[PDB]
Amino acid sequence: DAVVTQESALTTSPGETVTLTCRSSTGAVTTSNYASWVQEKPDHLFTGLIGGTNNRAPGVPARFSGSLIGDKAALTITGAQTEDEAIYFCALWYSNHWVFGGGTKLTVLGGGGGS
Amino acid sequence: MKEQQNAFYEILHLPNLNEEQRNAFIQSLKDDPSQSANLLAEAKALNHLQNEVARLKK
Amino acid sequence: DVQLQQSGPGLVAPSQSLSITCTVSGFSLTDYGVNWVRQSPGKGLEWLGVIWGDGITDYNSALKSRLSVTKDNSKSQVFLKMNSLQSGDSARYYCVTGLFDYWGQGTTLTVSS
Structure with a gap:
């Protein structure tokens, strides 16, 4: 009966660094929760970003990285880009099922460059 | 006893578990042998997920 | 070059069932x-199941x-x-790889009350 919780919203701007977090109601997030991160963009387009805590999916830009920070899983964007404005979901594995967080709406205010 | 023997054998041959995970399942099987079935299922799932991690390392 | 392509009827109204194929x-x-x-339209993501190798x-x-x-x-x-x-099963359904790294394009299902 685990519940996965994420920030409802965060605001950044191009070139800044932002960290999204993923909390487990059962205790600390560990390797065995295989924390995974997916991006939803408009028209219900999903792109996987990080799988198994810290592995970038093929083709995912280097500015996305995953880690455990304290008791939570974390997705860091080092140098945010305007196209990164989107909803980000995390998923945690609990013995025999996946549970998704509620998603974080990331706003990227202003215009920027990027990779 | 024989069921714990079989569970030990299967867990030790799951190829993608790391040794911390193996140790945890072994200890759980020693603590609660009556849970062997569930524990074995849980280990097989972690092995499945470790296999996915190896794919993404690659 | 991973590709997941969804097809099939989706909803079959004569039975009350959903059938989707992921190639x-x-x-x-x-x-x-x-x-x-x-x-679903107003909810989050719900995991349905996985089939392993x-x-x-x-x-x-x-x-x-x-x-x-x-x-x-x-x-x-x-x-x-x-x-x-x-009706609560109305949703967009997706097949996905093992750590949600690659997604199919989705299949829309609307079930009337």
């Missing part, structure tokens, strides 16, 4: 698993008795069947 290319189903997830299937326990996930290793196809549909 995968770029990896072998004998090695790696495929998840199914859905997203060896055929072991893990299901969402709230839905398991209405679900059948099967696969054909030679055709590289994974099949979702969901029975006894209700």
